[PDB]
Amino acid sequence: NHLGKTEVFLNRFALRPLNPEELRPWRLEVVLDPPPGREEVYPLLAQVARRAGGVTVRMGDGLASWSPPEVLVLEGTLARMGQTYAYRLYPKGRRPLDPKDPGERSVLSALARRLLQERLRRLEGVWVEGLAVYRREHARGPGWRVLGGAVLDLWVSDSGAFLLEVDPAYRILCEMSLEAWLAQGHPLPKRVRNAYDRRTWELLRLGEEDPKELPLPGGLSLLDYHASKGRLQGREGGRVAWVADPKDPRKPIPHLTGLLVPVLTLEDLHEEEGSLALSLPWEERRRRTREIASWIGRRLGLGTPEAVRAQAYRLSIPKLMGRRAVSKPADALRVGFYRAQETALALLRLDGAQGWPEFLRRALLRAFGASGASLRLHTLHAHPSQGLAFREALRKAKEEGVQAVLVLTPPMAWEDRNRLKALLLREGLPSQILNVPLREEERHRWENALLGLLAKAGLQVVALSGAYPAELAVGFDAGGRESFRFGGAACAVGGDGGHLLWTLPEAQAGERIPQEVVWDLLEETLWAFRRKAGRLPSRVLLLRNGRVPQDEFALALEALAREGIAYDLVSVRKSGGGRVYPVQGRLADGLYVPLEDKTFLLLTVHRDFRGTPRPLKLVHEAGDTPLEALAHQIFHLTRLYPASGFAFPRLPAPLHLADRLVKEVGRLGIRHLKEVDREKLFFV
DNA sequence: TGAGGTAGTAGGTTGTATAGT
RNA sequence: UACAACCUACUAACCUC
Ligand SMILES: [Mg+2]
């Protein structure tokens, strides 16, 4: 191996192997009347396990248990969606389960988790939300405190052992009223909860009215209203507070500040504490992870926790290329781009002012100078409020070779931002916005805005230097919408990643991307590779954001086999990787950690040393490229994103682009994209 | 809208098996 | 439901370049 080995700890701990009585759970038969539906079987079975109590989990069509039937509610009644059923439990003995059998250890682990939860529920000083445990004051001020603990998990090995997952976690509690909060000179919090229940509102403003005078729609005083329900007992109705239901933050509602409690944010605390942060340096997290794990092991009698370790790998550093070797995409602004064509940019200024800021102009001229490419800056002399007659100023601009526009503007309301984006997109003109109180020392901002303006004009700013198995990398994501998704793809064309492009996403009902939309988009990207390389990819790298729905790539994978194209399919989850800590030494990004076959973690980015990194968890779902070669290429693709400039995304450029793309399309809509070259990354 | 990201609180989504015969 | 993978608002926050 040409890669440097390192050992790592996972945030998992090995515990004792299950004993006989744990391997052979009480079985039970479930007799539900009226007999269940089909989509309603498991949900009711689970609500029966929960209604029977003890360490009980559903198992198949009946239930498993680590509790004696003599402490189980064997007869009962539960109310599901509309219908009221009655259940009965028939102790079918005690069959043993086998940890190798996937759904059997699925049951063993289910029971482990329920056990852990019950052991936790009985602990005295601790606060326990589900599997989260908070046990120690971490910070505090007048009226508030922050509790520290950890989220946990207990499951069963393939080899019959208990497994503990631990990750330090915090909870912010405010137990003071709004009145006191505001009386200590702090600012209004954006959200606020009822003091007498969980109902939570957005806090609009404070009221000038008198509680005892404010007539409540159909009845009494604000004060008299609340008094009625006995809420002023042991409390002091404060001032008038106008709040709103977050679902429709229009219609204001009267409330009293003595009966509201602030919902706090880290910044509401930064007014007080200032030096309080909730993320941890990785070594601190590792330490507390170990302490808490030992603490639980000691409250659990499942042995002494032995931190599980894995073999990690230092991946080769990606060689990023501008015109010359580069270390971050912003450096391309000084050295030149990987491949720059002739370009024409336009300016839309929407403050009172006029013309290109000289430093931007010079930065651009230098970059194209350095790149050995011609540049022609234009300036739109028209305003959006000229209604549509400015579309014609837009018409002019496309008839001279303008590939993208800079909008120099005051901060825009989201609505107007979209209105404008759309408006310029109709004419196939991607826009980069730059907020206009702007000064040359705000360098990372205008240089990122510039890098984005350039990606949006179709320039390739950086590429990789290296030989990778796949000559085509395409990432698939689903949706930038609520009740339905979009599902689209983006593209790193060439082994150098010499080209990036996007594909029009297609409206769909949920996560799963229709098999045929998958193959369609893929085909679009095959056409791209073909028409710039004159040949078909020998191998493609297929990437999904998140879990991959059952055989949703099947049609496309078969289409690929047919056309004699080799391929790999990787599922890239942002969650589920847990944690990774060096046994010795520092931790740098580029970490590759094999877990089972078909799966591995990748610590792709580390940079904000006040926080702890979250490895991606990746599953090799199809294909037969060595795990290490996939890791290597994913890792390098992380560095290919043009629009970030000073920090790399945690996701590989195609998946990060696909994400940005379906969020933009979900935001602006799908219309107005007919006239946009797919090489202009309009959405970064 | 500069961009990347770790941490919170409060409120949401889809995806899987699940029978009958 | 849990489990699994996610989204939104607070967040143009906070930290970092
Ligand atoms: Mg952008």
Side-chain angles (χ1 to χ4, degrees), chain A residues 2-23 25-27 30-31 34-38 41-43 45-46 48-49 51-79 82 85-91 93-94 96-103 105 107 109-120 122-157 159-189 191-211 213-227 229-235 237-249 252-265 267-272 274 277-289 291-318 320-323 325-340 342-353 355-384 386-390 392-395 397-464 466-574 576-608 611-684:
Chain A
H2 64 303
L3 298 194
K5 318 309 208 179
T6 318
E7 255 188 347
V8 297
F9 287 118
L10 305 178
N11 65 334
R12 313 217 255 239
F13 302 81
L15 297 163
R16 167 253 284 191
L18 284 58
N19 69 45
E21 301 294 331
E22 288 159 354
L23 305 153
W26 276 278
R27 212 235 180 250
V30 182
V31 190
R38 170 158 170 252
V41 169
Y42 285 168
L45 281 184
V48 160
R51 215 167 263 204
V55 182
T56 73
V57 302
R58 142 209 148 262
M59 186 181 39
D61 44 308
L63 274 38
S65 194
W66 275 344
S67 275
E70 304 82 74
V71 300
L72 282 161
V73 180
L74 303 180
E75 215 98 29
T77 79
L78 71 55
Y85 320 86
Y87 64 86
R88 179 129 155 178
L89 287 305
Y90 283 146
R94 283 186 64 172
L97 284 80
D98 181 80
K100 326 257 177 187
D101 178 307
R105 71 181 155 112
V107 177
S109 293
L111 284 163
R113 204 193 277 93
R114 272 294 312 168
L115 192 265
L116 174 53
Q117 188 178 350
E118 288 299 319
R119 290 307 150 76
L120 285 175
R122 307 168 31 237
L123 289 173
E124 302 283 20
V126 311
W127 176 18
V128 176
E129 299 203 53
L131 277 160
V133 187
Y134 309 97
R135 10 140 286 197
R136 268 182 220 173
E137 204 179 68
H138 172 266
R140 100 179 272 278
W144 63 270
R145 57 205 174 96
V146 173
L147 311 196
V151 322
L152 313 160
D153 203 338
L154 215 47
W155 70 83
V156 179
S157 273
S159 53
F162 281 106
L163 265 162
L164 206 49
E165 188 180 23
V166 173
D167 198 22
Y170 300 78
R171 276 236 156 230
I172 311 164
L173 302 164
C174 180
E175 283 142 334
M176 218 152 56
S177 76
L178 213 63
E179 187 68 355
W181 191 246
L182 304 176
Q184 289 196 10
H186 307 62
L188 291 76
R191 292 142 80 207
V192 77
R193 169 175 64 79
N194 274 339
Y196 39 76
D197 61 45
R198 310 212 341 130
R199 195 149 166 59
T200 317
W201 323 75
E202 312 219 323
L203 180 63
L204 309 176
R205 69 193 169 269
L206 290 176
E208 353 278 318
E209 28 272 314
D210 176 330
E213 297 286 18
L214 201 60
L216 211 49
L220 315 105
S221 277
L222 208 53
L223 201 152
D224 287 63
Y225 171 55
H226 285 286
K229 310 212 115 65
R231 287 157 181 176
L232 288 192
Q233 318 278 328
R235 281 197 266 256
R239 296 166 217 229
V240 171
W242 288 98
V243 306
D245 194 322
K247 299 183 185 33
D248 51 295
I253 304 107
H255 216 315
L256 304 154
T257 67
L259 309 169
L260 290 156
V261 173
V263 164
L264 292 188
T265 65
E267 199 196 4
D268 292 341
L269 307 182
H270 279 164
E271 222 77 27
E272 278 228 41
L278 288 196
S279 45
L280 312 167
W282 70 259
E283 321 84 29
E284 203 78 10
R285 188 171 292 271
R286 162 168 146 251
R287 183 172 50 82
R288 229 160 299 142
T289 295
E291 305 179 351
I292 298 165
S294 298
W295 189 92
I296 289 281
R298 257 187 280 259
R299 271 96 183 150
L300 220 52
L302 291 177
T304 305
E306 198 186 22
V308 128
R309 25 174 80 192
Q311 279 295 332
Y313 299 81
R314 296 260 79 115
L315 299 175
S316 88
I317 302 167
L320 230 64
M321 217 62 48
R323 237 180 81 85
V326 98
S327 80
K328 71 215 170 224
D331 283 348
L333 285 173
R334 281 135 219 145
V335 154
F337 313 110
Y338 182 81
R339 164 182 83 264
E342 81 142 331
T343 311
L345 280 94
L347 178 92
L348 177 72
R349 219 204 183 118
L350 300 170
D351 60 357
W356 282 86
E358 69 279 22
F359 67 97
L360 299 173
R361 186 179 215 113
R362 287 174 344 232
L364 279 181
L365 294 174
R366 227 134 37 201
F368 281 82
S371 76
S374 58
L375 179 68
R376 154 186 54 241
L377 284 76
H378 290 264
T379 289
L380 300 180
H381 296 97
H383 194 276
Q386 290 176 72
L388 198 117
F390 92 124
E392 304 96 347
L394 292 180
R395 111 176 110 193
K398 35 153 182 159
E399 187 273 335
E400 294 93 56
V402 173
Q403 296 168 325
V405 172
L406 219 48
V407 187
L408 257 199
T409 174
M412 323 180 61
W414 199 240
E415 308 307 353
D416 298 322
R417 178 274 192 188
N418 295 335
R419 191 172 322 268
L420 182 71
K421 289 302 207 101
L423 187 33
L424 302 170
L425 229 26
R426 311 199 169 26
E427 307 296 332
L429 294 177
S431 66
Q432 171 67 45
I433 295 188
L434 185 47
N435 272 320
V436 78
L438 170 70
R439 343 162 202 285
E440 179 178 343
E441 81 278 6
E442 289 168 323
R443 180 187 137 237
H444 301 93
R445 200 178 106 215
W446 63 259
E447 273 184 347
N448 257 356
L450 247 189
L451 280 182
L453 185 60
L454 298 175
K456 292 177 197 206
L459 275 87
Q460 183 83 28
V461 329
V462 294
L464 292 167
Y468 314 111
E471 315 175 359
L472 184 64
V474 181
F476 295 84
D477 193 26
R481 275 298 213 109
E482 355 300 322
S483 41
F484 68 100
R485 308 283 208 276
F486 266 91
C491 205
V493 160
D496 59 325
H499 296 265
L500 305 166
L501 231 84
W502 55 275
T503 67
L504 204 51
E506 183 66 65
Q508 52 185 54
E511 264 310 295
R512 164 177 254 107
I513 300 176
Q515 319 221 345
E516 339 142 349
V517 174
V518 170
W519 168 244
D520 182 23
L521 297 172
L522 187 50
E523 181 178 347
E524 227 209 59
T525 73
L526 294 173
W527 272 93
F529 177 92
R530 288 279 250 119
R531 76 177 180 268
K532 52 206 35 178
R535 180 189 59 93
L536 275 200
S538 40
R539 186 100 74 119
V540 289
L541 176 57
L542 272 177
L543 310 165
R544 250 283 192 156
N545 270 342
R547 227 194 193 289
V548 162
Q550 70 155 352
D551 42 51
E552 81 166 351
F553 274 84
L555 199 173
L557 294 181
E558 91 185 352
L560 283 171
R562 308 189 332 213
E563 305 280 345
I565 305 164
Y567 66 77
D568 292 274
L569 190 68
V570 181
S571 171
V572 187
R573 300 84 172 284
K574 308 179 227 190
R579 252 55 154 179
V580 156
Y581 310 113
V583 181
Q584 291 179 357
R586 299 196 350 143
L587 153 69
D589 52 36
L591 221 49
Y592 158 67
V593 193
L595 281 190
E596 289 87 41
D597 289 304
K598 90 189 297 167
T599 169
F600 65 93
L601 312 179
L602 196 74
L603 192 29
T604 262
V605 148
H606 179 40
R607 124 176 182 70
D608 325 299
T612 296
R614 262 156 12 220
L616 301 164
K617 179 202 182 93
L618 304 88
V619 187
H620 189 193
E621 218 81 69
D624 72 346
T625 284
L627 221 39
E628 175 210 324
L630 294 174
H632 180 260
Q633 179 159 9
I634 306 299
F635 178 44
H636 286 204
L637 280 160
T638 65
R639 306 291 181 251
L640 203 53
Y641 191 69
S644 83
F646 306 94
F648 301 104
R650 189 165 68 111
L651 286 179
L655 280 191
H656 195 68
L657 286 173
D659 184 38
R660 252 34 160 198
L661 164 68
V662 311
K663 284 181 179 169
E664 264 302 281
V665 172
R667 223 130 56 187
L668 267 171
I670 239 177
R671 298 178 31 93
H672 319 117
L673 297 169
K674 321 116 174 204
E675 289 317 346
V676 179
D677 305 21
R678 321 274 190 252
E679 24 155 358
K680 285 188 220 176
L681 319 177
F682 70 103
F683 56 85
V684 299

